Amino acid sequence: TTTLAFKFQHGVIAAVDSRASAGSYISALRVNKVIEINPYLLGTMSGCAADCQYWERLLAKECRLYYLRNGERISVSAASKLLSNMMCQYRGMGLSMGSMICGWDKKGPGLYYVDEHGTRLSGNMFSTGSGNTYAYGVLDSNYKWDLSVEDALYLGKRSILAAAHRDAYSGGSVNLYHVTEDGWIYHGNHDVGELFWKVKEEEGSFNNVIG
Amino acid sequence: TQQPIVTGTSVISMKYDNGVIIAADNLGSYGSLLRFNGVERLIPVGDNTVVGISGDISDMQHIERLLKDLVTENAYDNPLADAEEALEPSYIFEYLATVMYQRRSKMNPLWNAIIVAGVQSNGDQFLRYVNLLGVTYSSPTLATGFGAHMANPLLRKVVDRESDIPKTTVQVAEEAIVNAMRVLYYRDARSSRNFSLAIIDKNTGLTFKKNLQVENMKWDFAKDIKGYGTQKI
Amino acid sequence: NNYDGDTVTFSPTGRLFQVEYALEAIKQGSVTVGLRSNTHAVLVALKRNADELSSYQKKIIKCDEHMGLSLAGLAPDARVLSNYLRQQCNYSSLVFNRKLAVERAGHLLCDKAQKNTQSYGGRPYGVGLLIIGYDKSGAHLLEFQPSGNVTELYGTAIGARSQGAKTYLERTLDTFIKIDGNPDELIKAGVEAISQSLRDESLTVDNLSIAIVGKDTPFTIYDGEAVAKYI
Amino acid sequence: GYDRALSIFSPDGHIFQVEYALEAVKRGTCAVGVKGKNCVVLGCERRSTLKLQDTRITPSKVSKIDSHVVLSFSGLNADSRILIEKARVEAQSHRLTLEDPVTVEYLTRYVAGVQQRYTQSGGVRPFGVSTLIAGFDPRDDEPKLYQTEPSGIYSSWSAQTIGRNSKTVREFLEKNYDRKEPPATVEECVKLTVRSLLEVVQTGAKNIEITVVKPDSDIVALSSEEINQYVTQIEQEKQE
Amino acid sequence: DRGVSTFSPEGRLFQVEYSLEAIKLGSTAIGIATKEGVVLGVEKRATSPLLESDSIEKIVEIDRHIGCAMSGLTADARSMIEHARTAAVTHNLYYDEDINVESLTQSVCDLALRFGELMSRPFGVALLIAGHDADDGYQLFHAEPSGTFYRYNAKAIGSGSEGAQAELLNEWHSSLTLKEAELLVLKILKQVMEEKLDENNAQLSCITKQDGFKIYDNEKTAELIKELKEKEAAE
Amino acid sequence: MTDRYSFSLTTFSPSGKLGQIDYALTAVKQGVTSLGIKATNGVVIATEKKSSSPLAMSETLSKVSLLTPDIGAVYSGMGPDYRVLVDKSRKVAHTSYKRIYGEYPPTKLLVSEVAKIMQEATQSGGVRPFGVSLLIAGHDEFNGFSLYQVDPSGSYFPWKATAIGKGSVAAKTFLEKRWNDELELEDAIHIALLTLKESVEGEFNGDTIELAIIGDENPDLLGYTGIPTDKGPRFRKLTSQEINDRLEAL
Amino acid sequence: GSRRYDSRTTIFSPEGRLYQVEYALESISHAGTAIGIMASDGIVLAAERKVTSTLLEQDTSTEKLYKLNDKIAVAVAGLTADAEILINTARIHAQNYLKTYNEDIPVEILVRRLSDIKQGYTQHGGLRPFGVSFIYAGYDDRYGYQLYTSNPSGNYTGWKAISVGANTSAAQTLLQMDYKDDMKVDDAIELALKTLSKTTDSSALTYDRLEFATIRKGANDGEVYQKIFKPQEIKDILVKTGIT
Amino acid sequence: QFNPYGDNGGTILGIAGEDFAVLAGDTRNITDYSINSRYEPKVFDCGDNIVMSANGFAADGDALVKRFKNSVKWYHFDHNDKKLSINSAARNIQHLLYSRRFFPYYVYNIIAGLDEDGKGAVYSFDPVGSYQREQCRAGGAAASLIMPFLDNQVNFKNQYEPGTNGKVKKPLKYLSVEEVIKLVRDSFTSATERHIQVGDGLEILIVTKDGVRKEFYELKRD
Numbered sequence A: 001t002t003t004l005a006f007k008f009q010h011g012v013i014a015a016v017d018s019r020a021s022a023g024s025y026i027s028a029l030r031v032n033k034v035i036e037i038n039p040y041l042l043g044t045m046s047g048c049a050a051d052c053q054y055w056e057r058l059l060a061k062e063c064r065l066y067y068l069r070n071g072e073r074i075s076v077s078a079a080s081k082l083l084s085n086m087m088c089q090y091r092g093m094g095l096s097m098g099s100m101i102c103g104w105d106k107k108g109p110g111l112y113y114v115d116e117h118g119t120r121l122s123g124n125m126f127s128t129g130s131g132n133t134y135a136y137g138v139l140d141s142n143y144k145w146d147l148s149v150e151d152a153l154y155l156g157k158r159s160i161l162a163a164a165h166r167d168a169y170s171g172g173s174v175n176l177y178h179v180t181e182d183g184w185i186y187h188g189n190h191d192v193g194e195l196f197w198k199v200k201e202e203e204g205s206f207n208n209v210i211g
Numbered sequence B: 001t002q003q004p005i006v007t008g009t010s011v012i013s014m015k016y017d018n019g020v021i022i023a024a025d026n027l028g029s030y031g032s033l034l035r036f037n038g039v040e041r042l043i044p045v046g047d048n049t050v051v052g053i054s055g056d057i058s059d060m061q062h063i064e065r066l067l068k069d070l071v072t073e074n075a076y077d078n079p080l081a082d083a084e085e086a087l088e089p090s091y092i093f094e095y096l097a098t099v100m101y102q103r104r105s106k107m108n109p110l111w112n113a114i115i116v117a118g119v120q121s122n123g124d125q126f127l128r129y130v131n132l133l134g135v136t137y138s139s140p141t142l143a144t145g146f147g148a149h150m151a152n153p154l155l156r157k158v159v160d161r162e163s164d165i166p167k168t169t170v171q172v173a174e175e176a177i178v179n180a181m182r183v184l185y186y187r188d189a190r191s192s193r194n195f196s197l198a199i200i201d202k203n204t205g206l207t208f209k210k211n212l213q214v215e216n217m218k219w220d221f222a223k224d225i226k227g228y229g230t231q232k233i
Numbered sequence C: 001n002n003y004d005g006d007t008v009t010f011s012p013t014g015r016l017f018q019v020e021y022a023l024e025a026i027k028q029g030s031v032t033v034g035l036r037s038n039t040h041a042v043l044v045a046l047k048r049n050a051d052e053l054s055s056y057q058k059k060i061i062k063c064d065e066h067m068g069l070s071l072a073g074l075a076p077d078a079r080v081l082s083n084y085l086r087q088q089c090n091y092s093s094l095v096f097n098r099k100l101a102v103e104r105a106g107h108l109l110c111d112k113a114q115k116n117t118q119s120y121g122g123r124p125y126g127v128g129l130l131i132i133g134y135d136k137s138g139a140h141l142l143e144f145q146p147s148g149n150v151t152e153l154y155g156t157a158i159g160a161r162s163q164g165a166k167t168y169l170e171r172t173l174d175t176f177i178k179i180d181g182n183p184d185e186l187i188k189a190g191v192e193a194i195s196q197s198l199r200d201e202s203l204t205v206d207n208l209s210i211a212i213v214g215k216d217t218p219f220t221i222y223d224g225e226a227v228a229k230y231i
Numbered sequence D: 001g002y003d004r005a006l007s008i009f010s011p012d013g014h015i016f017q018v019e020y021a022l023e024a025v026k027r028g029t030c031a032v033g034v035k036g037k038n039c040v041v042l043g044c045e046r047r048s049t050l051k052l053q054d055t056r057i058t059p060s061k062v063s064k065i066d067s068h069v070v071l072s073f074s075g076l077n078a079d080s081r082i083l084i085e086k087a088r089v090e091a092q093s094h095r096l097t098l099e100d101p102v103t104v105e106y107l108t109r110y111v112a113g114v115q116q117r118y119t120q121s122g123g124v125r126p127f128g129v130s131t132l133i134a135g136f137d138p139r140d141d142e143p144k145l146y147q148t149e150p151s152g153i154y155s156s157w158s159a160q161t162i163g164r165n166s167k168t169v170r171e172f173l174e175k176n177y178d179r180k181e182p183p184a185t186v187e188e189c190v191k192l193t194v195r196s197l198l199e200v201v202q203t204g205a206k207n208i209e210i211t212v213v214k215p216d217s218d219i220v221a222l223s224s225e226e227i228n229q230y231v232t233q234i235e236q237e238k239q240e
Numbered sequence E: 001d002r003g004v005s006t007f008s009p010e011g012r013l014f015q016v017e018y019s020l021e022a023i024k025l026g027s028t029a030i031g032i033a034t035k036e037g038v039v040l041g042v043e044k045r046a047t048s049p050l051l052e053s054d055s056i057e058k059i060v061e062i063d064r065h066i067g068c069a070m071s072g073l074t075a076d077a078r079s080m081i082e083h084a085r086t087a088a089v090t091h092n093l094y095y096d097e098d099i100n101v102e103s104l105t106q107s108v109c110d111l112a113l114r115f116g117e118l119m120s121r122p123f124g125v126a127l128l129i130a131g132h133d134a135d136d137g138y139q140l141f142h143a144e145p146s147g148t149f150y151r152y153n154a155k156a157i158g159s160g161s162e163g164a165q166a167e168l169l170n171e172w173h174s175s176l177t178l179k180e181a182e183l184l185v186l187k188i189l190k191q192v193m194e195e196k197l198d199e200n201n202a203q204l205s206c207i208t209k210q211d212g213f214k215i216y217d218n219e220k221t222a223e224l225i226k227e228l229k230e231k232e233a234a235e
Numbered sequence F: 001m002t003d004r005y006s007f008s009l010t011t012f013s014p015s016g017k018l019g020q021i022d023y024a025l026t027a028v029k030q031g032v033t034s035l036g037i038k039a040t041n042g043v044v045i046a047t048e049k050k051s052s053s054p055l056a057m058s059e060t061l062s063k064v065s066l067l068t069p070d071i072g073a074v075y076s077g078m079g080p081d082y083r084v085l086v087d088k089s090r091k092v093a094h095t096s097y098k099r100i101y102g103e104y105p106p107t108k109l110l111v112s113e114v115a116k117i118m119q120e121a122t123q124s125g126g127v128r129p130f131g132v133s134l135l136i137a138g139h140d141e142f143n144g145f146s147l148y149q150v151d152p153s154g155s156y157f158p159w160k161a162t163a164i165g166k167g168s169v170a171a172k173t174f175l176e177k178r179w180n181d182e183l184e185l186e187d188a189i190h191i192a193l194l195t196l197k198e199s200v201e202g203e204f205n206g207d208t209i210e211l212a213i214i215g216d217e218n219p220d221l222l223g224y225t226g227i228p229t230d231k232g233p234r235f236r237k238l239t240s241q242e243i244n245d246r247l248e249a250l
Numbered sequence G: 001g002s003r004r005y006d007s008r009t010t011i012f013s014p015e016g017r018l019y020q021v022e023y024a025l026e027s028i029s030h031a032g033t034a035i036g037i038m039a040s041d042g043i044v045l046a047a048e049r050k051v052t053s054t055l056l057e058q059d060t061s062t063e064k065l066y067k068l069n070d071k072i073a074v075a076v077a078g079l080t081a082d083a084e085i086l087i088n089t090a091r092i093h094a095q096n097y098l099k100t101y102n103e104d105i106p107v108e109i110l111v112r113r114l115s116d117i118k119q120g121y122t123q124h125g126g127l128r129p130f131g132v133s134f135i136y137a138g139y140d141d142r143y144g145y146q147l148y149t150s151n152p153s154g155n156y157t158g159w160k161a162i163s164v165g166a167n168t169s170a171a172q173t174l175l176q177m178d179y180k181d182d183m184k185v186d187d188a189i190e191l192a193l194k195t196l197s198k199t200t201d202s203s204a205l206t207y208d209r210l211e212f213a214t215i216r217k218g219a220n221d222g223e224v225y226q227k228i229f230k231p232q233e234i235k236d237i238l239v240k241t242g243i244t
Numbered sequence H: 001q002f003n004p005y006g007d008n009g010g011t012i013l014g015i016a017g018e019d020f021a022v023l024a025g026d027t028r029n030i031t032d033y034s035i036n037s038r039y040e041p042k043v044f045d046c047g048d049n050i051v052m053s054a055n056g057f058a059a060d061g062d063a064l065v066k067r068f069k070n071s072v073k074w075y076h077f078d079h080n081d082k083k084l085s086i087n088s089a090a091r092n093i094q095h096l097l098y099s100r101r102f103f104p105y106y107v108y109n110i111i112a113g114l115d116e117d118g119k120g121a122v123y124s125f126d127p128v129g130s131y132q133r134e135q136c137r138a139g140g141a142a143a144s145l146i147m148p149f150l151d152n153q154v155n156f157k158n159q160y161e162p163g164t165n166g167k168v169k170k171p172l173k174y175l176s177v178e179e180v181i182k183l184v185r186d187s188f189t190s191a192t193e194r195h196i197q198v199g200d201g202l203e204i205l206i207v208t209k210d211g212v213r214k215e216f217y218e219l220k221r222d
């Protein structure tokens, strides 16, 4: 698995892979590792699929109830905290969940990392899963705040591709998302096999691989 | 979680054209010690069902009491207790299966393997298995423990699939069961010569045979076997 | 008088007034009829509306594929008792792979209602029920009173003006019991029975509610244009 | 446990215990709340039947629930402490779970909910307390003033009074307070709050307490001399 | 004294009947169901001119497809609304769909008779629950403290209810538009209210399939009031 | 079932009276007279053995009870209420003191514990107050000899000498004239016997009177030897013969 | 059932008063008068024992003045048994605070805690309230010397001088007349005894009918000392002030 | 020590068509190297045009199916006989599975039916409740043998159009029910050859707007 998310001038980008494995066997080529909590909130998935789905769909329940009670949309900070507090109850019981809560609120674009230990970190850039090291390399060397939406989408896409290539448990396809103040926008499913050959030619990268 | 102490070995059974047959030996083993020789492991419930139990005997005696209490409870405020609202084999089995799965789910199992044999109201044959894990399955032949490894192969030669059931008579089925019990006595170290056999027929009802013995055994060829290879004397 | 403040108090003549007052709530309720043959059992219920803008309160509740009832009195109490029946029918299926006998269902309702008549703090149920069903001993009809009394009958009626329908069924006893293998004729007899309890108002399309269960017929409820056939 | 239903309906559709709790509020000392353009002022009556009192240590009538919200009341004093404690706990509980301080509306809704719960729970009686809750929402410069009562209903007010002779001071506020142009400054808002209490109080000495709450957690309580200057100026204009 | 769950000699629960008297003292709330939507309107009834009327919240959102109006002891409604919102969202969690209006109403009514010696008394508030689902379309329910709920084409609750209900008897037909229903609620509210109806002491709302539940602005309602005055002066 | 009386049965009346406590005190007034006198080197407590029938063996009914080796008690009012209070008093001396500190409680603290039990019956749900007044005499190292009275309310007072029950008013007057701060134990016993004779109608002897003392340590009543610091109980119940001997010198 | 016999101790009257609290206050008005006076250099607690006997052991007796900790004491008016229940709870609370924060409990915090317990008995549980009124005399390093009172309603207030129990109306008038802010402990001692001597229902005020206590910074250097007066010491101060 | 879990073998396969869906599974039940039954049904009609199979530990599989069938029954009671949509059933099953997050149902579950637009639908679950909608899914013992074949013959993976040499993929043309059943039968016949736990019989449940139909085929019994 490889997931990432970063803040920038024009919101936040969220990119994930699509592979699921049972040992060496690839049990799924195309799983959705982004959860649509609400039209202004997203959540990545790494660790146990069941734990990520259950607790984040339950976070959505709680974020919706918030809106009904207060007539206002919940902040990214508060949503991330509610989630981290759920993890804190099954503390030590064996849950496995690593996610990044992406959204836009009154303070602008927001991004929090949350894991099963109850950890909750605010930051401009995060990446989780077995392939996060490969993604961080591409991100750290190409990231700017002055990024255009077009270039930013490509960065997160190219970063997943880097991990899908090297990490055996990462691959399948890339799912892209862009979060604006008017909500999140899905930017499609991109097969890694086709994307790889395309990027190699157009970029000139992956010279070591023959095509 | 426990361990079984006093145990009962194989229970074997099969369907035939008009009903079912079930059998089990009369031994209660204490490890390698053949401690109790008069143990009945086939327990009739009414005149249409026989429950055959293997594994822990103390848990068997507990199940025996649950079934006895089930009959008592079914008769309460039930004018048709000996007729339309009598206990069916399917009712008795599902009850036990519910109990077995609940007990394993509390990590405190009844250390048994059970076969419920009987005939339903509509004359249909009933034969289903359940064990300490709550695992259930049905087949034309069913056997527990060693019987699964040695008896089923012999009984499946008579009834290999569903279509063979109407072609199988009670004399043939009983002959196969009795032969299987002899084979288990030859080869199962926790078996006894003495056993019980029950037939539930849709016409002749429940026939319960006690104090049966394995007979017509072949041992004479043993006299010619000498040494373990090179010895002649 | 002095002995009607709670359910835990007998009167000097040995009466339980709170139970009798609960029985009174049934008499205020809208009429419902029950009757059976040897093959089928039928419920017929006159639904009541609040006004012309309002809907007609539902009277019949399904408990299982082979069992259900009609209500007269406090509707929320019928929901509680019908929920209990649904669970008991369901316990019998899941544990024993056995459809719950109608007679045993009556015994369970009796015992549940009884506990509310002997304890302090609680109250009796304020509803009467007519349970129909088809089990291993054929068709059945039961009448439930919140006193705890449950009775197996060929036919009956409860609610306001129910005495008219009950007399009709008492005359027709020998006829409708013989209506075997003919669901429509058995319903006709039920619709004709409930008609003996009507005054001023008549049976319209959104007024009438019918239910049936039988040998090869799951418990099904008929409302709206589905009962226009019988008007 | 003691489960007895004390708050119940009567034949005419009244819950007498809740209504008798309002009579306890009627007995309590007068409390008033007035919101200006950029502030809210809370005025409170102190009955002068009790002298030889130590005013340093005596429980003050206005209580801080958080750094940005205050609560005053009329009715049973002991009952008010329980509501204040619960409110203070909820304020910190909100900051801890949501990472924002409570809004004035939220805090009011919570206190009102506690009051309501005590009108249909077994073995308990209603709070004999009405509250005035005032403050400013985080990063907001719009004044907030709410009222609660034993039944559990709550609402927002441009200006409001509760307690004994509240009928009289509400009469004063209704004719003196203009919605189109509220007290533009702190002075005007305090002056109007003192004027309203002078209709009922008796002597303008130690009988009037004033607490000014401004935006961004700026809360201060006026002293005796500061209030006395308002009392002096009001009556000197009145002699005409 | 006497039990809280006691039956009267007539076969009614004393406490339930007494709570109905409290609802009669409440401010008027009216609901009208049409094939274009359901309209909900309420009398605010401010006790004083200093009370900021926009803080009076007697019309409430339960879900995007379900709205609710209240009359009686309005403080009692808060826990009922909380339960309704939880039930609606919980069902969406379990079944990935909107919940039926009837099922939501039934869930609220299950609380009603959970009182004894559970809560100590019945609720002293009635609710008009309006909404839309794919199975039964636009619906309006009246939820009482007895645990009973009736569906209605149109319904009025509160102090001016029997007068308003008689008026709704004559005016309602199956071909009403949404605009016609809006004016009809305003007309009947103006008739039964003590004070003169305006945008500040009365509130409108509606539920449509497209836009969901919406509370009307005071500017939007003011225009509908002006439109009402002119059409009544037209004959 | 379940105890559904979770509310107080003792409440304030408009006049500020707690009725059930007052009525409990009235029950104590009807009770047989008992008294206590404190000396310089001891304390004495006494009462009449009012036998309900001559066929009854009054020796089996003990009105004067040992609570600890150095503390004793007597009562006036309802006997059964006393008996259970003695059971609880004996137990609380162990659970709330001896099992913690390894020694028996001082008189005042055991009295405090008994008082608490009696106060709780005056406020707790579904109970009536105890219908007894207790006189508790005792000794401990740091406080010396002491005598306490405990009422149904749970209030307790230390006395030099006092009386409760039937003829308490007359007996307290009799004690005021005779008591001084220089009395020896034998003098206090003599005064106790004189005081008690006034309230007794019928037979007045060792078989109809119950009397005990808190005095010197009794090593003969300890039951074992070998530990110097353990010297025996200070509580001792006088025999029928021992009482009669002092009635000849009366 | 049981409902029949329930007095309903926690309900409002039609006028908005708590019946049992008002009746408990009526009980307290018959209790021995207790007075507290706060000075610049200390606090005085004086209290009258109720119609005693000559055979009562006074030197080991305590019905009015109790020690909560080294810095705080209370004077009692009402049911003594009820007061001891609350006193032991207050002693525990003070020790809980000391264990938690390693500092002596501020006076008001202790007073609020006890007053909250009293409040609870008026709002829930169906039990009768505690028929007790306290005068709290204490010291801490925030507010210095402090006097408080609490009553069965659970309401508490601070005072410069205050009385509880019998004849508080007469007693409060006398205190209000002669009290001044710059007063000292020795003067306050005299005022307390003079007030009791005029308000008492007894024929004459003697040592055996009094309990007395002071809280002074008259302890060697910056620290506070509690002095529960002995019978002989009460007899001496009565002669000194010129009452006997 | 007591092991509450077991492995009853078996293999299941779900394929979603354009306007239909199939859920197939072998009928062999086993423990270790023994056969318990040559015909023990594993795929069930649960009502509302939904089929289900919980493969793995048969005791947990029978319990889950039994509970879901019950959930359908109560959905009708509680929501006015409303039809339970396949997406709603899938979400419900997630919550049934996660109710045992710490003592899981040891089964891989698949359901099949039609969505609300009438198109074919398959949903696939893990033991703890992760689920997602899929086109093709093989579950159980021989899942790793079958899925690669389905990637190739259903989704035409690694297949390109002759002459272009890798430039143009093979177009994803829709499959008929008859074409799907062939791929199912060949999948199980191949699995039966190379996997000892697969054999005896094959039962297929086909779902269309007309209802649920069954088909049975013999497999090798060795």
Ligand SMILES: O=C(C[C@H](C(=O)O)C1CCCCC1)Nc1ccc2ccc(-c3nc(-c4ccccc4)cs3)cc2n1
Residues within 6 Å of the ligand: A001, A002, A019, A020, A021, A027, A028, A031, A032, A033, A045, A046, A047, A048, A049, A129, A130, A131, A169, H124, H125, H126, H130, H131, H132
């Ligand atoms: O997160 C991880 C694994 C970790 C990783 O690769 O870094 C591993 C590190 C290497 C050792 C093992 C752990 N896997 C994820 C992540 C997100 C996931 C999101 C959805 C799914 C879904 N799987 C089904 C599904 C699958 C198989 C069968 C049936 C259903 C449905 S949805 C699976 C997901 N699996």
Ligand SMILES: [Mg+2]
Residues within 6 Å of the ligand: H191, H192, H193, H194, H195, H196, H197, H198, H199, H222
């Ligand atoms: Mg094979």
